[PDB]
Amino acid sequence: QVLFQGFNWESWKHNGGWYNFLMGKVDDIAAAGITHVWLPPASQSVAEQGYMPGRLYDLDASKYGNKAQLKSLIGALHGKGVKAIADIVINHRTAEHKDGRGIYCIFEGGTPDARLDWGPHMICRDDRPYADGTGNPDTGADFGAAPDIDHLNLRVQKELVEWLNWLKADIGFDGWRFDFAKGYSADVAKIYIDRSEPSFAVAEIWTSLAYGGDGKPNLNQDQHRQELVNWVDKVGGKGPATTFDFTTKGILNVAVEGELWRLRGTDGKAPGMIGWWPAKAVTFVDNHDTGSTQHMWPFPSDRVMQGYAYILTHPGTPCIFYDHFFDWGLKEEIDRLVSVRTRHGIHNESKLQIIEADADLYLAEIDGKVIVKLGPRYDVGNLIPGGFKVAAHGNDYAVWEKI
Numbered sequence: 001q002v003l004f005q006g007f008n009w010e011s012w013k014h015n016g017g018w019y020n021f022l023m024g025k026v027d028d029i030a031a032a033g034i035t036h037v038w039l040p041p042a043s044q045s046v047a048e049q050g051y052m053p054g055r056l057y058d059l060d061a062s063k064y065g066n067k068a069q070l071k072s073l074i075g076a077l078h079g080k081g082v083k084a085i086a087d088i089v090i091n092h093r094t095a096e097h098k099d100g101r102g103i104y105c106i107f108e109g110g111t112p113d114a115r116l117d118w119g120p121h122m123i124c125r126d127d128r129p130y131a132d133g134t135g136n137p138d139t140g141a142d143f144g145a146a147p148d149i150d151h152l153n154l155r156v157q158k159e160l161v162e163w164l165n166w167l168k169a170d171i172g173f174d175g176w177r178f179d180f181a182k183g184y185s186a187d188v189a190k191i192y193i194d195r196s197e198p199s200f201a202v203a204e205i206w207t208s209l210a211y212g213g214d215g216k217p218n219l220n221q222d223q224h225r226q227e228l229v230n231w232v233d234k235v236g237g238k239g240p241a242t243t244f245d246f247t248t249k250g251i252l253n254v255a256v257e258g259e260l261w262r263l264r265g266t267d268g269k270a271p272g273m274i275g276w277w278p279a280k281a282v283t284f285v286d287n288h289d290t291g292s293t294q295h296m297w298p299f300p301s302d303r304v305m306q307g308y309a310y311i312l313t314h315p316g317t318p319c320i321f322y323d324h325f326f327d328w329g330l331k332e333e334i335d336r337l338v339s340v341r342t343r344h345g346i347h348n349e350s351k352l353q354i355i356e357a358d359a360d361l362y363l364a365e366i367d368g369k370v371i372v373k374l375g376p377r378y379d380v381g382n383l384i385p386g387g388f389k390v391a392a393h394g395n396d397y398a399v400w401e402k403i
């Protein structure tokens with residue numbers, strides 16, 4: 001299951017439309033051995049990139065293109081074996097109309113009928129000024145800029161599950177990416193996972209790593225991955241729900257700048273969520289927020305290849321990012337890593353064994369068939385065993401495969 005992020009922060013800007021543009025990269029995405037691609041927010045939204053949605057059913061006002069174009073793209077992907085997954089932004093919603101009070105707290109789902117046309121009652125009790133006090137309090141975090149949806153309300157629950165099943169049915173999406181899954185509770189999410197039953201669902205729980213007396217992350221980030229492990233757990237360990245492993249992204253960001261000892265934690269196992277529940281963890285080097293033009297938490301650019309060398313050989317489900325693959329000229333090495341990965345049947349739950357994690361050498365063995373070395377350590381020699389040919393190498397990584 002190697003996922004791809006078919007967009008970045010600037011994609012909505014594209015001359016001629018992102019969906020259309022992306023039609024042209026379908027063959028290449030399919031060839032690379034990519035099983036799923038994460039598409040941006042499809043409906044109408046105040047903020048052009050889509051994370052500020054209003055008329056949930058109006059795909060035609062998307063800056064990425066329209067409903068027609070989306071079903072053409074998703075048809076293409078499906079035509080060449082890959083699954084499309086959608087960015088579900090349901091913690092907050094922007095309203096279409098002012099109620100008399102003068103607050104924009106009256107919604108419009110996009111259709112002549114009443115689906116999704118809620119009002120201030122569906123906004124969380126305390127989200128002033130939007131909320132009129134009559135809804136439930138927020139089950140999770142708040143998003144400053146917009147109305148928060150009260151997911152404890154039953155009409156919100158039914159019509160939102162309706163919209164979800166419509167997106168699988170009419171549009172053809174296969175699974176979900178839950179934006180700001182901290183915005184609402186794991187219990188709420190489970191109702192949406194469970195009742196729309198997607199073939200894949202990854203949630204975005206993003207919180208800070210812990211920092212010691214140096215301005216640098218601790219080595220022990222167990223409080224941080226625990227939070228990811230508990231969401232998957234409360235939501236359903238047997239469900240399709242997984243979460244982006246922000247703990248490996250954080251550690252790795254630093255680790256790669258000559259601190260590869262950070263890559264074996266307090267327990268001699270990988271410090272990320274992949275060291276406690278690789279199965280439910282999907283790894284990434286960067287996404288539209290951490291990187292792209294937001295640069296919220298960038299991976300060292302001159303090292304994004306050691307990032308990929310690590311997430312493509314290691315357990316967890318890897319996620320490649322449009323940019324790195326298509327625009328940074330790394331298409332080929334990324335490809336090659338994906339091939340080593342698929343050739344040896346490495347997957348979700350591959351056994352990982354760390355051999356060395358010193359400042360200048362992280363050397364590890366996946367499933368007994370592949371060994372990945374990250375680092376500038378020249379004299380690696382003696383540590384990689386008999387019967388191992390090198391599969392790929394590049395800037396400060398090399399992977400060997402059992403012959």
Ligand SMILES: [Ca+2]
Nearest residue numbers: 111112113117
């Ligand atoms: Ca309506």
Ligand SMILES: [Ca+2]
Nearest residue numbers: 143144146148
């Ligand atoms: Ca709010």
Ligand SMILES: [Ca+2]
Nearest residue numbers: 140141148183
């Ligand atoms: Ca919320």
